[PDB]
């Protein structure tokens, strides 16, 4: 190259993603899954292996640490063995969760330089440092994610926290309301292994259609819907009407029994918090976003949400990438690559003169 | 995807035959660029702007040319901003002019003699770009009887 | 829509090669779904004019 | 002179015979090889000016005879048996330049032999990789015409002598001296496509740490590789190349799986010789997908590159190894389906039906049991095509493929007839599939079939007989009997149960997580030969004592009885023929007990199940 290479390792709610700064992909993607009996010593790919008799847990669900000895343990095994590099030759962009309190900020900060040791760092709040790739510094950012959703409004790189708003839906809550209706329909759902794999059945082949009454019409006068799938564990599990409608409790919190908020109510909240000089500036420019892509077909309903959100005498214009399953990580990859960042970048020898909170005070 | 659009651009405004670190260079120097900006009357009008500038010059039909063109591409206004601003800097016959023994509905207007004069400066353009060609066989090869051995030959550096 | 936005892609390439732009046909349509996603077109025309110079000193 | 044109009749009936397309290639003019004014090769006083003058006469005669055109006071005589042009420099001549100029000459003597190089290497006669071999020796001609007329440029101003001009052509002979090496390497010998570029890649990695003619060496190869791409860019990805010159590795023939096309053994490069059978291999592919119809468009189609030690130009072809053959098979198994083929042998040749065998036994016996010489083939046909759509084993298309096949032979092929011991199975593909299951799979599947009728012929046989002896006091032929279906129900259950169907549905598994068309053709190969040699075919000591056994096992139950010679439908005659036949048997089979023992067990541990006939006695 020119410079010293680039390094970003982001520790996400579902998945570890590392890499250089500068590819598409992401070099490296592993699980966050943290390994203990139901390894113990080793995490990543082995205690993923090892599941079935060992417990999955993630040390961020709700955007928040749940337990501070799995993240700290999990980021330092994938510097250790995951990756194997030298520290001085790698600064390396961490990216929290969203709404993470001031003192998360100080624990990720003497943990990356403590037991995980860079020369240099930088953390930052996730859908903002998604939103300077797709090459604004403006817009509303619907991250949706496995452990949890949230609407970040953000203008001129910064992100006020009281208006961005958390929402518990994710995959996790599709997931457990798909084992939820059919155990209760009747079906053995029974090991943790099957768990998972039924999950991926529900993340792979799923199809997800705009309207509901007319396809289930449809699907109950004649079904044909259905297309079957036979892994090598044997089970077959299909049903065409139900996989359409089992995520429409984003928007509908009464097929479950759940009184909440819907998704556009959240996007309405949250575009009410933002002025209305920057709502024309915000909406020139709205992006689609989040894990869920894995297949597309909730991204067209997004869309039609975020085109009835605000007042119709001006046509959306929407930046739609060819992927955005890599979303967070495109995000880091832009920031790592500039040149004029490494003067917002925090050094070891501003975060020792000025204490271990200036990681708060510098990242703006 | 967006990280592959400036890079994308970088290509193909590359030609081939280092420049192989480079690519992947000038793809930074395009973010670096990109956020210097973002930190710090229709879009028609501009198109009018310049086709009156082609009328001041002469050619008529091309300015023209243009509004009926941009008459259609009313049905892109963000792209036209930025044609504006490269439509200045560029990289670093017909008969019917003096003819009336032509048709049957034919003007009468009578003799010009106002830029006849300047319908054989028509002529003394394409004679001035095949004496323009003989002056550049003159001079690459004047440039060559007078030099000296290899101080542009590198056979003498083996 | 497509056939519309095809012709309307023509007169587009049509109006920027009589004036004569060092562009061509691919950088018009990166430049064009540029401008389609949102992007600030102030920053796209510092990055083409400083690339069309930076390029030449490596050739 | 005169060898050239025995050279491009060789070359040019070479071309021709080896395949139809591109022939008659182009001839220059006559007034090419005529006039040396294509090639460069080549008043005063001598004797009587001083010597200042002199010195300044040879300057000025160098600085002629350096380029093409002919020194004034020297030129060149013809070169005669020499590969380089012998000068005649003008006598009376100071001694003290005469060593001087005989330094400087040797330059003009290596150059001689570089334009007649070029002109007899431009040639179509001579190939399309010499082509651009001698269309980037051209280029350095030119340069150094362009050096010798800076050197008269200084030379008109009165400052170039003999030392300065000594100084300034020996950069200007490590570029001269080198194409006149090489050259009288490529000229010795045919040298064309890759034999060239090996030539080319051991006098590149003979001065490659010189660093001033590694350049050189680097330039020649990387403007001739690029004719030779074009033909790596047809053969690698589609099936299809016509190439006139016929200087690729792969030559084309009319001729089908080894003879169509066929590595020539020099005429491949040095860097590409490991990888070869590869090349040979990923065109064959495409050829025998593109008469199926189908893609033989591939992605990884892209425009080759060379560069120094590091492979570009190894490693496309891999990439391409690995797409192709998969892209066959995959057609294979979605689309004409070899799993159905494979099923419909097994139901046959294995006798994996029931039914089908027994109505196809009982219709046909009396049939069968006819001499040849006497045999109806069309009735054969017929009750075939009946004994079928009787079972419920008639769910099959590939039925048609079984014909009434004839064999004179019993057995003989691995050292008079009737129609039960000549008749034999048939199966059939399509050209496209035959190299798949070939001849010698076909043979080795008909010689497994003619060992099964023997067994399912002598399971009916002492049928027969138990059932119409039942004396009611009567067991003496009941033992011997019973000590024949003792081994020939073991090996019933020891081959079938054991041998052929557990691997059997393994395999069914392993021809879909096989990789490529080589994988398949292993372990379909490996399965029917080894299983076949594990059957009474191959032996170190050949078990013709297996054959000796079965004879008396078939003259015993029926051919000697037949209906016990109607004594209840008697003199205890039978009973010397059950002495008999006990002894024969006891002695051909311990000789075959004894032989499965001393060589390699499973059959002996079974049939010895709990101690029985584990030993009656060893030999002699």
Redesign the interface.
């Known amino acids: 190259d020119d410079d010293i290479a680039a390094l970003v390792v982001d520790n996400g709610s579902g998945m570890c993603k590392a890499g250089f700064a500068g590819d598409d992909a992401p070099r490296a993607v592993f699980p966050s899954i943290v390994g203990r009996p139901r390894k113990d010593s080793y995490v990543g790919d082995e205690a993923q292996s090892k599941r079935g008799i060992l417990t999955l847990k993630y040390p961020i669900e709700h955007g928040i640490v749940t337990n501070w000895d799995d993240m700290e343990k999990i980021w330092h095994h994938t510097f250790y063995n995951e990756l194997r590099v030298a520290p001085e030759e790698h600064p390396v962009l961490l990216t929290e969760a969203p709404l993470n309190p001031k003192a998360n900020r100080e624990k990720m900060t003497q943990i990356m330089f403590e037991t995980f040791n860079t020369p240099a760092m930088y953390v930052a709040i996730q859908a903002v440092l998604s939103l300077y790739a797709s090459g604004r510094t403006t817009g509303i950012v619907m991250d949706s994610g496995d452990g949890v959703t949230h609407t970040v409004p953000i203008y001129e790189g910064y992100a006020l926290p009281h208006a961005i708003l958390r929402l518990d839906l994710a995959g996790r809550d599709l997931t457990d309301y798909l084992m939820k209706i059919l155990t209760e329909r009747g079906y053995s759902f029974t090991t943790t292994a099957e768990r998972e794999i039924v999950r991926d059945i529900k993340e792979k082949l799923c199809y997800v259609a705009l309207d509901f009454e007319q396809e289930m019409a449809t699907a109950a006068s004649s079904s044909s819907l259905e297309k079957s799938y036979e892994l090598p564990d044997g089970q077959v599990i299909t049903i065409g009407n139900e996989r359409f409608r089992c995520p429409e409790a984003l928007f509908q919190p009464s097929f479950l029994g759940m009184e909440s908020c819907g998704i556009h109510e959240t996007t309405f909240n949250s575009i009410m918090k933002c002025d209305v000089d920057i709502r024309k500036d915000l909406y020139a420019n709205t992006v689609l976003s989040g894990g869920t892509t894995m297949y597309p077909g909730i991204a067209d309903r997004m869309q039609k949400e975020i085109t009835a959100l605000a007042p119709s005498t001006m046509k959306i214009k929407i930046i739609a990438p060819p992927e955005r399953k890599y979303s967070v990580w495109i995000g880091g990859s832009i920031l790592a690559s500039l040149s004029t960042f490494q003067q917002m970048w925090i050094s070891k020898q501003e975060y020792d003169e000025s204490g271990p909170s200036i990681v708060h005070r510098k990242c703006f | 995807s967006i990280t592959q659009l400036f890079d994308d651009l970088c290509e193909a405004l590359l030609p081939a035959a280092n420049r192989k670190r480079a690519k992947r260079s000038l793809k930074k120097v395009a973010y670096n660029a990109l956020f210097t900006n973002l930190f710090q009357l229709p879009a028609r009008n501009k198109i009018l702007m310049l086709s009156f500038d082609l009328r001041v010059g002469g050619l008529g039909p091309k300015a023209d040319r243009l509004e009926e063109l941009v008459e259609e591409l009313e049905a892109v206004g963000s792209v036209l901003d930025l044609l504006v601003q490269l439509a200045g800097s560029g990289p670093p016959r017909d008969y019917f002019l003096n003819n009336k023994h032509v048709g049957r509905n034919v003007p009468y207007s009578g003799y010009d003699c106002d830029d006849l004069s300047v319908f054989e400066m028509d002529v003394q353009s394409l004679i001035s770009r095949e004496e323009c060609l003989c002056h550049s066989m003159i001079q690459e090869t004047l440039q060559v009887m007078e030099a000296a051995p290899g101080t542009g030959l590198p056979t003498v550096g083996l | 829509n497509l056939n ?1 936005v095809r012709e ?1 892609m023509d ?2 390439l ?3 090669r ?7 046909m ?2 018009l349509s ?27 000193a ?2 | 002179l005169q060898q050239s044109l025995e050279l491009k009749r060789k070359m040019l009936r070479d071309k021709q015979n080896k395949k139809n397309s591109g022939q008659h290639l182009p001839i220059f003019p006559a007034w090419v090889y005529e006039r040396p004014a294509l090639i460069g090769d080549f008043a005063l006083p001598i004797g009587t000016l001083p010597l200042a003058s002199q010195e300044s006469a040879v300057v000025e005669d160098l600085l002629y005879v350096l380029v093409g055109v002919d020194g004034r006071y020297v030129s060149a005589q013809p070169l005669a048996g020499r590969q380089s042009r012998t000068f005649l420099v003008d006598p009376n001549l100071d001694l003290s330049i005469r060593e001087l100029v005989h330094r400087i000459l040797p330059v003009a003597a290596s150059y001689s032999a570089v334009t007649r190089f070029i002109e007899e290497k431009s040639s179509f006669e001579y190939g399309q990789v010499n082509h651009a071999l001698a269309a980037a020796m051209r280029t350095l001609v030119k340069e150094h015409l362009i050096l010798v007329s800076q050197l008269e440029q200084l030379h008109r101003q009165g400052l170039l002598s003999l030392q300065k001009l000594w100084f300034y052509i020996q950069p200007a002979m490590r570029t001269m001296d080198i194409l006149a090496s090489l050259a009288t390497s490529v000229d010795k010998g045919e040298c064309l496509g890759g034999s060239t570029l090996s030539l080319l890649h051991d006098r590149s990695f003979s001065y490659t740490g010189d660093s001033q003619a590694q350049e050189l060496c680097l330039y020649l190869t990387k403007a001739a590789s690029a004719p030779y791409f074009e033909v790596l860019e047809k053969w690698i990805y589609r099936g299809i190349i016509h190439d006139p010159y016929s200087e690729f590795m792969v030559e084309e023939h009319e001729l089908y799986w080894d003879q169509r096309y066929t590595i020539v053994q020099q005429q491949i490069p040095s860097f590409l010789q490991k990888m070869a059978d590869k090349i040979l291999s990923t065109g064959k592919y495409l050829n025998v997908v593109r008469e199926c119809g189908h893609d033989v468009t591939c992605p990884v189609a892209k425009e080759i590159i060379y560069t120094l030690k590091e492979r570009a130009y190894v490693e496309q072809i891999e990439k391409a190894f690995n797409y192709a053959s998969k892209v066959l098979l995959d057609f294979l198994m979605e689309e004409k389906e070899l799993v159905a083929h494979l099923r419909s042998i097994k139901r046959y040749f294995l006798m994996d039906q029931g039914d089908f065998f027994v109505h196809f036994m009982d219709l046909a016996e009396e049939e069968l049991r006819k001499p040849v010489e006497d045999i109806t083939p069309p009735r054969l046909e017929a009750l075939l095509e009946l004994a079928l759509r009787m079972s419920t084993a008639n769910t099959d298309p590939f039925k048609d493929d079984l014909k009434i096949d004839l064999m004179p032979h019993d057995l003989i092929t691995q050292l008079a007839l009737s129609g039960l011991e000549a008749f034999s199975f048939d199966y059939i593909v399509k050209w496209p599939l035959s190299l798949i299951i070939n001849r010698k799979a076909l043979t080795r599947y008909q010689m497994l079939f003619r060992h099964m009728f023997y067994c399912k012929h002598v399971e009916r046989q002492l049928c027969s007989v138990w059932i119409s002896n039942k004396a009611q006091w009567f067991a003496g032929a009941f033992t011997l009997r019973q000590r024949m279906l003792n081994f020939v129900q073991n090996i019933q259950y020891y081959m079938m149960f054991e041998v052929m169907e557990p691997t059997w549905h393994i395999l069914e598994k392993n021809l879909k997580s096989a990789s490529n068309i080589d994988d398949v053709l292993g372990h379909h190969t490996g399965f029917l030969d080894t299983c076949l040699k594990d059957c009474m075919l191959t032996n170190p000591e050949l078990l013709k004592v297996f054959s000796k056994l079965m004879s008396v096992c078939v003259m015993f139950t029926n051919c000697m009885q037949k209906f016990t010679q109607s004594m209840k439908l008697l003199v205890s005659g039978f009973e010397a023929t059950i002495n008999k036949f006990d002894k024969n048997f006891s002695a051909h089979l311990l000789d075959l007990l004894a032989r499965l023992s001393i060589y390699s067990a499973s059959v002996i541990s079974r049939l010895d199940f709990n101690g029985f006939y584990t030993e009656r006695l060893e030999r002699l």
């Open positions: 519309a309307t007169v587009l049509e109006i920027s009589i004036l004569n732009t060092g562009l061509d691919e950088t990166i430049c064009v779904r540029l401008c389609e996603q949102g992007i600030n077109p102030e920053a796209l025309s510092s990055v083409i004019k400083e690339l069309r110079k930076a390029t030449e490596l050739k």
